[PDB]
Structure 1
Amino acid sequence: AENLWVTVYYGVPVWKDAETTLFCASDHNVWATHACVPTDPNPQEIHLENVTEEFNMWKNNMVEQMHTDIISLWDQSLKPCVKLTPLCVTLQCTNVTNNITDDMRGELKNCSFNMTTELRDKKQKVYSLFYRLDVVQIKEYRLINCNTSACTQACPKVSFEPIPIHYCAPAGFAILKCKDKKFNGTGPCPSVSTVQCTHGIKPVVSTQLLLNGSLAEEEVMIRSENITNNAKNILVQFNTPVQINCTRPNNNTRKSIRIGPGQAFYATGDIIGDIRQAHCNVSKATWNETLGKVVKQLRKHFGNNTIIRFANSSGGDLEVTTHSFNCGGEFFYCNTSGLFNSTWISNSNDSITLPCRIKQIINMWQRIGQCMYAPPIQGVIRCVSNITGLILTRDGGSTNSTTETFRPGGGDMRDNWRSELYKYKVVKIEPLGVAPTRCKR
């Protein structure tokens, strides 16, 4: 009675979840745009009506691809640069005590040593200023990395400034974007569009604080894979940014030492004037208001009468125990202890100053056996940035006490990329379809 027959259609709008490899789109830098395609001046977006999709920020392969690409670019940038093999020698060091304050005592060492020259039968005697974090006693010292591995020096022409990067999918695939505000990264998204590729994402590297990021359009957003489990980090996205001003005030000097044929080592000659600690400033009232918003949002998941505490970091490496970042080529590690120190109970112009340190031997990613020596920057340096989120961890959490304490976290860089690619996913089209129809061939 039905007398229906199979009929084939090619080009039906159907898709399935899939994994693939996306490519560049961008408008001397470590993040090489030379091997990246130009971007379209007028990106196109198609809003899909009546399409409700499923999203999960904690199972996105784009984060893994971004991490791999960033690591590969960082490795590639350092290949054509000098290797500081001859720098593992016996240094003879002395304390620097010329116009120093009470908090910069012992931080700097004036170290002299012997070095090779362009002719392989000659030696020279030179000296440089090193940081206490870089030299370990063997009045004789050695560089910290000498017993682990020899490692290279960043070329002084490449810039560390992040540049936006867009990720565009191949043919036969599509990128779906969730336009639903208040979307907490997991679950169903009623409102969806299709994009050729994503907004410009700056690969900013930092810990304990998200800088130069994107802001929630409505209010503070809290995200966690399993908020009941205390072993999972909590990503907080601010509604408004908090300005932070960091500075190294020492008037540094740079000198070049020829260590071979066409090979130079950039040493810190001397410091002009006084010697003082680098530091950062953040407004007090703005931080208090932001923490008020954060605790108000946290009360939603952890009860309405719970006491919410902010405390110091637990411990570990300097990278994870401190807010670590890079300001114009100099690598800062700073003590965010005046920020996360307070308790909240259910019911002018001064600023918080974070004093902090600088380093030159860097293990950027969580790897052992590869350094990166940062040449000194000449003159005073200052920078300003926006804080637009936090990475928190809940300690303990047992039912014995009704007080919840949160501490800063970080270390893993995948959490930094996850905060930007939370509303995107990749699918692959399935154009072949079959239906009942009343013809017959």
Structure 2
Amino acid sequence: AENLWVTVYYGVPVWKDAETTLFCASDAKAYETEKHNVWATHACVPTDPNPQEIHLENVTEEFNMWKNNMVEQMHTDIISLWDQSLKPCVKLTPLCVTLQCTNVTNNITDGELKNCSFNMTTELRDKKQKVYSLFYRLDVVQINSNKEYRLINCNTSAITQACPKVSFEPIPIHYCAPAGFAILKCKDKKFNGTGPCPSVSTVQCTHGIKPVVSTQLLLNGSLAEEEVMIRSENITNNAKNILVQFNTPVQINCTRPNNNTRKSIRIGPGQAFYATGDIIGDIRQAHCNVSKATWNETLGKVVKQLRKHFGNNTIIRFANSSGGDLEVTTHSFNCGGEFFYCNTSGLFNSTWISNNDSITLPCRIKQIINMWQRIGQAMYAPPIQGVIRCVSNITGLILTRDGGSTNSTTETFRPGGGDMRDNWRSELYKYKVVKIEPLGVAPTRCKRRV
């Protein structure tokens, strides 16, 4: 009748919030960039060629773009991915010798590069090698007459050379839960990063992102929907780095317009070096071109959602970064196997109140790098034969603001950020983990026989 009981049902739609280990998926056409494992695909299960998505209703959960621990694991996944894609290849310890460097072989009209000589060990052990190479002003530093340089990392740590096949342009991948776990997606348009998410779906496998090592900007990824996104961790804390998700895509086309030459250098036994050969012909510096129409509207679209985040009547200013390291002052990103660093001054430069051709930015060609703050490992990116180009939908942004100032009168906004964890927050705001608990319980009025 009415005195309640305990009744068991198995397979109930019930789960718990807990964090654990997923497993990779990566489509089957993305399986085809290879280069002896670009990133990590080996025995990895290819994405279910149609990752079934099951729409849910009457389902609520708190998502977070800050304490999310899928940012936590991802930030050290890509570190060791990078580490293990490096640790069986060639050491360059004999390359920490003083390099004779001098203004590069040109007819002046300055150059930025230098024509630099040194000795080196060949196949035989007792005989050495006279050979010269070309480095950028960031690859070398003047340790102390013609200016004398060392490899800038000798003062710090030991280095490595990559196996030249590895293609570094980011590659699409999916994410699947094994059984006993599921994945939830927060399919909403105005999500303030804290509180209840409005729309949840579940999958065994997710979408496709690209590991874009981009400070400041975000590209190659996921655009916003309708009105341009103005997200914050907590809209009253300037020490937290601030993230943006564009709606309109701004089309980029970075290029290193120098038909590059690669040198075969025997420095074994077995070991080799790929030196920067002679640049083929006319001399141009790497850069990135951007369309003017889509940028002019990313101004007005973003702007009017900021007077919705502070004051309907005020003055808003933008300026570039005053100083730090090139990752945060310039745009840091790999373009074709090497890293570009474009002076971001022409952008962060505007003033806003209440109410056919192209442009570009100058980018420095950097080959050696000590990224991921993996204290102990810097390395050299092998030269890239041929002219480089790389395009992408510009998608996101990292920036900051000033302080108290003259209140309501004006305020400044500048670039920076850097820490690759807030870049992973540009896609992880909409993903969290669940575990399935099929054994529910309920008090009906029934009982089992003796």
Fold match by TM threshold 0.5: yes
Deviation at 1:399, TM superposition (A): 5.4
Change (3 A) 1:3 1:260: closer
Counterpart secondary structure, 2:412: strand
Partner of 2:103: 95
2:25 corresponds to: 25
Contact 1:99 1:273 in 2 (8 A): no
Task: Give me the whole-angstrom Cα distance separating, in 2, the residues matched to 1:85 and 1:20.
Answer: 40
The 8 Å contact of residues 29 and 159 in structure 1, kept in 2 or not, is answered as no
Alignment check: 8 A CA contact 1:128 1:269 kept: yes
C-alpha contact (below 8 Å) 2:314/2:408 kept by paired residues: no
Q: How far does residue 265 in structure 1 lie from its aligned partner after superposition?
A: 0.9
CA distance in 2, matches of 1:317, 1:352: 25
**Aligned residue number for residue 10 of structure 1:** 10
Distance 1:397 1:366 in 2: 33
> 2:47, 2:205 within 8 Å by CA — same for their partners in 1?
no
Cα RMSD between the aligned structures?
1.8
Q: Write out per-residue CA displacement over residues 270-313 of structure 1, whole angstroms, 9 at most, x where no aligned residue.
A: 22323222222222332121111111111101111121111111
**In 1: Cα distance, 2:317 partner to 2:407 partner:** 16
1:434/1:280 CA distance change after superposition, 3 Å: closer
Distance 2:384 2:441 in 1: 66
Aligned residues: 435
Deviation per CA, 1:212-253: give whole Å up to 9, x if none. Answer: 111112220111111111112221111110012222222332
Is the partner of 1:34 in helix, strand or coil?
Answer: coil
- Contact kept? 1:182, 1:218, Cα under 8 Å: no
Which stretch of the first structure deviates more once superposed, 218-227 or 400-409? 400-409
Q: CA deviation at 1:24?
A: 0.7
| Shift of residue 137, structure 1, vs aligned partner | 2.0
Judged with a 3 Å threshold, the aligned counterparts in structure 2 of structure 1 residues 68 and 35 are, in CA distance, closer, same or farther, namely farther
**Would the aligned equivalents of 2:228 and 2:301 in 1 still touch at CA under 8 Å?**
yes
Q: Confirm or deny: 8 A CA contact 2:6 2:441 kept in the other structure.
A: yes
**Partner SS, residue 322 of structure 2:** coil
Structure 1 residue 48 displacement after superposition: 1.6
User: Structure 1 residue 405 and structure 2 residue 412: aligned?
Assistant: yes
Deviations 1:176-215 (A, max 9, x none): 1122222233221232211112101111111111011111
Instruction: Give the TM-score, by structure 1 length.
Output: 0.94
- C-alpha separation between the residues in 1 aligned to 2:50 and 2:108? 55
- Cα displacement (A) at 1:85: 0.9
**Contact map agreement 1:222 1:297 (CA 8 A) in 2:** yes
* TM-superposed deviation, 1:267: 1.1
1:31-64 Cα deviation digits (max 9, x unpaired): 1211421111121122122222222222221122
Tell me the secondary structure at the aligned position of residue 289 of structure 1: helix
For residue 350 of structure 1, report the CA deviation from its aligned partner. 4.1
Q: Could you tell me how far apart the structure 1 residues matched to 2:313 and 2:338 are?
A: 45
Q: Say whether 1:303 aligns with 2:311.
A: yes
CA deviation string 1:346-390 (max 9, x = no partner): 11x343321121111111212332112011112322222221111
Task: Measure how far apart 1:161 and its partner are.
Answer: 2.0
Partners of 1:21 and 1:170 within 8 A in 2: no
* 1:50/1:190 contact within 8 Å kept: no
Do the aligned partners of 1:29 and 1:160 also contact (CA within 8 Å) in 2? no
User: Contact 2:178/2:204 (CA < 8 Å) preserved in 1?
Assistant: no
Of 75, 79, 84, which residue of structure 2 is paired with 1:71? 79
Out of 193-202 and 359-368, give the one that drifted further: 359-368
Indicate conservation of the 8 Å contact 1:100/1:275, yes or no: no
What's the secondary structure of 1:437's corresponding residue?
coil
Q: CA distance change for structure 1 residues 367 and 396 in 2, over 3 Å: closer, same or farther?
A: farther
Deviation at 1:29, TM superposition (A): 4.0
Q: Output one character per residue of 1:78-132: Cα deviation in whole Å (capped at 9) or x when no partner.
A: 122111011111222221151454xxxx511111111111111111211111112
SS at match of 1:290: helix
Residues 381/11 of structure 1: CA separation in 2 closer, same or farther (3 Å cut): closer
Q: Which has the higher strand share?
A: 1
- Which residue of 2 is the match for residue 256 of structure 1? 264
- Secondary structure of the 2:379 match is coil
Query: Quick check: 1:29–1:161 contact (8 Å CA) kept in 2?
Result: no
Cα 1:286/1:359, change in 2 over 3 Å: same
In the alignment, what sits opposite 2:129?
124
Deviates more, 1:4-13 or 1:36-45: 4-13
In structure 2, C-alpha distance between the alignment counterparts of 1:435 and 1:322, rounded to whole Å: 60
Q: Which secondary structure does the structure 2 equivalent of 1:123 belong to?
A: coil
Runs of 4+ residues over 6 Å off in structure 1: none
Q: Please say if residues 63 and 432 of structure 2, whose CA atoms lie closer than 8 Å, have aligned partners that are also in contact.
A: yes
The answer on whether the counterparts of 1:99 and 1:275 sit within 8 Å (CA) in structure 2 is no
CA contact 1:330–1:359 (8 Å) conserved in 2? yes
- How far did 1:266 drift? 1.2
Q: 1:436 to 1:132 in 2, by over 3 A?
A: closer
Cα distance between partner residues in 2 of 1:55 and 1:280? 36
User: Is the 1:184–1:221 Cα contact (8 Å) retained in structure 2?
Assistant: no
Name 2:31's counterpart in structure 1: none
- Quick check: 426-435 or 381-390, which moved more? 426-435
Q: 1:320: how far off? A: 1.4
Cα 1:271–1:435 shift into 2, 3 Å = closer
Task: Judge which range, 142-151 or 349-358, deviates more.
Answer: 349-358
SS in 1 for 2:293: helix
Q: Secondary structure at the match of 1:100?
A: coil
Q: Distance in 1 between matches of 2:316 and 2:37?
A: 43
Structure 1: runs of 5 or more not aligned: none
CA separation of 1:364/1:30 partners in 2, compared to 1, >3 Å: closer, same or farther? Answer: farther
**2:248–2:294 Cα contact (<8 Å) kept:** no
Comparing 197-206 with 416-425, which one deviates more in the overlay? Answer: 416-425
The aligned counterpart of 1:420 is 427
**Greater Cα shift, 32-41 or 15-24:** 32-41
Q: 3-state DSSP class of the match of 1:148? A: coil
User: CA separation in 1, counterparts of 2:392 and 2:187?
Assistant: 27
The percentage of counterpart residues that share the same residue type is 100
1:316 is the counterpart of 2:324:
yes
